[PDB]
Design a protein around this ligand. Structure first.
Ligand SMILES: *[C@@H]1O[C@H](CO)[C@@H](O)[C@H](O)[C@H]1NC(C)=O
Ligand SMILES: *[C@@H]1O[C@H](CO)[C@@H](O)[C@H](O)[C@H]1NC(C)=O
Lengths: 8, 273, 275, 99
């Protein structure tokens, strides 16, 4: 399952 | 033991195209999904037959999270330009890897969550899944941001929970493919390179998984021996060979040793005209 | 097909400069240019651009829907397929509209905000542009009402990629390629997901404090305005800013932010009543 | 920026037997950045129907791609792979050795 991703 | 991995690549290419995002998903050495922002689908697509039974709720949910990643990592290219004070005119690469490993019993062993910018390590979730490794000064800012957002706690919960539970579901749904082991089919070739020397090559073909050990020995001692990178045959199996240069008349002294998950006992190969 | 791109921007003011580049077959090659559906009819009497096409003094006549064809000598036709279209929009032809955020410019992460473009000028369409973005401006029809023309741009759900500086433009019914002067910029700021600070009275000043390494803290009252202070480390690994109380109002909220991320703030602190 | 030249391997999916349909593979790996141009050649001429895998990379961040096409090997024709990359001034040509 694809992960949640966040900004740099 | 088994592994799940997502690999995503975002590239800027000013003047040659619009920024492109490509993500691929693997279970062990088998690719099963892909997303390409340069496609008219704009959906996450199946790439292995055993994942195609998943219902529309799966494809809706996955496309949503990966399009979100697409937008997020494309913006991360503009932020990196500011952090590093780089021109708008340059081409740049941003890569991410995510996933977990599980044991035979079906339990968590390791998790991963890493980025790189222009080919060099940027930030990485450490082994304990609680803190971040920042490679340079730009990545220290992202680390300070992600601590403030408690990112490590969310990825830790995802990597130990949803990631592992998904791998476990995938392994059963594609069991006959993902839990198969195709043993290596082996052969040896002899080519003279000179009057005094010849090349002996041990060949391994048709093997899954792709983890393998090809080793050469003279009279029993390890002879570190040319060794190509394991390569895909294109049908889901893999190939590799190892070669050594041998004095003419000493071919019987050399033996090739093969270790693979599909072989109950290690193979010993010996040349024979 | 080649890749056509305008640099620096396909949205360009009269008198500015824009260069059309035609990447065909791994180089900015010699190419011809085509307008509208006349893709078998090259513009400017078939000129073969050698590197790029720089239209240094941009006029309204420059506005249009362009395509390029790169030179392909060992081809039956000698030229490539038609490229992607690039629409050059020239601005500064009317007086600027106004741009307003509803309910306001601070937008919580995951929620929506309306960027309403409006003017006393009876614009047929409105164009919303995020500064620095290569993508085409969002287009909306101008709703006419009580002598004002207006359009509601919906932005969301809010993430950091949508925060930043926005401008909007108007066009008339007969001059769509011709845009108004750009409206005054509006800064949209996303709050969160960075953890909210603590806001308290000094046991007088109002303190914004977090274990999180915010480098700036922002104080906001319910009425509206904006005070900023740099964070200082002290009292137990806490990053905090003390805001002088002043020597008659209440209900203040605090946000943390980081350097080189001007439009990304933390979740607001809990509301504090100041007597 | 880190630039890594590609490793190239040219090989068949199955062991070559003259007259029997097979797959010709060009596996490029170890390269960075990701922009790469790969062609399969028959007697020096590019083969038109050539498919390729989705772009992926290794733990060391290096990219790898598999290019492949359906072919029937003969004794006469000589197959090869041509690779271009920002690290190469001119394309590198790797011949298929059936020996
Ligand atoms: C195009 O020419 C104008 C006028 O000489 C100049 O202002 C502008 O910088 C040039 N732009 C490019 C991209 O060459
Ligand atoms: C935009 O939103 C406002 C606020 O809800 C509403 O009153 C208005 O009718 C909407 N439409 C236009 C064209 O302004």
């Amino acid at each position: 399952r694809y992960p949640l991703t966040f900004g740099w | 033991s088994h592994s799940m991995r997502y690999f995503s690549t975002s590239v800027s290419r000013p003047g040659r195209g619009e920024p492109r995002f490509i993500a691929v998903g693997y279970v062990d050495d088998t690719q099963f999904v892909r997303f390409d922002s340069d496609a008219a689908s704009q959906r996450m697509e199946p790439r292995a037959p055993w994942i195609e039974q998943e219902g529309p709720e799966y494809w809706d949910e996955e496309t949503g999270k990966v399009k979100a990643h697409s937008q997020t990592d494309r913006e991360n290219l503009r932020i990196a330009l500011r952090y590093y004070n780089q021109s708008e005119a340059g081409s740049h690469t941003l890569q991410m890897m995510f996933g977990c490993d599980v044991g035979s019993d079906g339990r968590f062993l390791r998790g991963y969550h890493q980025y790189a910018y222009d080919g060099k390590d940027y930030i990485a979730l450490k082994e304990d899944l609680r803190s971040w490794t920042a490679a340079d000064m730009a990545a220290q800012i992202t680390k300070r941001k992600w601590e403030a957002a408690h990112v490590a706690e969310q990825q830790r919960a995802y990597l130990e929970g949803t990631c592992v539970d998904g791998l476990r579901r995938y392994l059963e749904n594609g069991k006959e493919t993902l839990q198969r082991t195709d043993p290596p089919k082996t052969h040896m070739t002899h080519h003279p390179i000179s009057d005094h020397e010849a090349t002996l090559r041990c060949w391994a073909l048709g093997f899954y998984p792709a983890e393998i050990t090809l080793t050469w020995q003279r009279d029993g001692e390890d002879q570190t021996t040319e060794l190509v990178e394991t390569r895909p045959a294109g049908d889901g199996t893999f190939q590799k060979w190892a070669a050594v240069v041998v004095p003419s008349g000493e071919e019987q002294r050399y033996t090739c040793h093969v270790q693979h998950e599909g072989l109950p006992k290690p193979l010993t190969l010996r040349w024979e005209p | 097909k080649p890749f056509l791109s305008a640099w620096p921007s396909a949205v360009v003011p009269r008198g500015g400069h824009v260069t059309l580049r035609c990447h065909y077959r791994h180089r900015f090659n010699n190419f011809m240019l085509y307008k509208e559906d006349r893709i078998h009819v090259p513009i400017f009497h078939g000129r073969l651009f050698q590197e790029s096409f720089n239209m240094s003094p941009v006029t309204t006549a420059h506005a249009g829907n362009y395509t390029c064809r790169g030179s392909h000598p060992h081809s039956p036709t000698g030229w490539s397929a038609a490229s992607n279209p690039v629409v050059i929009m020239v601005t500064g032809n009317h007086r600027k509209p106004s741009l307003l955020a509803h309910p306001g410019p601070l937008v919580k992460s995951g929620e929506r905000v309306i960027l309403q473009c409006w003017s006393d000028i009876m614009f047929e369409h409105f164009f919303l542009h995020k500064e620095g973005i290569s993508k085409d401006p969002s287009r909306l029809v101008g709703q006419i009402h009580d002598g004002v023309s207006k359009a509601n741009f919906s932005i969301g759900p809010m993430m950091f990629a949508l925060a930043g500086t926005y401008r909007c433009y108007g066009s008339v019914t007969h001059t769509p390629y011709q845009l108004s002067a750009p409206s005054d910029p509006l800064d949209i700021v996303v709050t969160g997901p960075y953890e909210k600070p603590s806001l308290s009275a000094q046991p007088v000043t109002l303190s914004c404090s977090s274990r999180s390494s915010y480098d700036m803290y922002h104080l906001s009252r319910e009425g509206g305005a904006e005070r900023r202070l740099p964070a200082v480390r002290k009292v137990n690994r806490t990053f905090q800013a003390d805001f002088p109380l002043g020597p008659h109002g209440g209900t203040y909220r605090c946000f943390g932010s980081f350097r080189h991320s001007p439009y990304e703030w933390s979740d607001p602190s809990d509301p504090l009543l100041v007597s | 920026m880190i630039q890594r030249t590609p490793k190239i391997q040219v090989y068949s999916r199955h062991p070559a037997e003259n007259g029997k349909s097979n797959f010709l593979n060009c596996y490029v790996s170890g390269f960075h950045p990701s922009d790469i141009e790969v062609d399969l050649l028959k007697n020096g001429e590019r083969i038109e129907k050539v498919e390729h895998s989705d772009l992926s990379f290794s733990k060391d961040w290096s990219f790898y791609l598999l290019y492949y096409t359906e072919f029937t090997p003969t004794e006469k024709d000589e197959y090869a792979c041509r690779v271009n990359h920002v690290t190469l001034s001119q394309p590198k040509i790797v011949k298929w050795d059936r020996d």
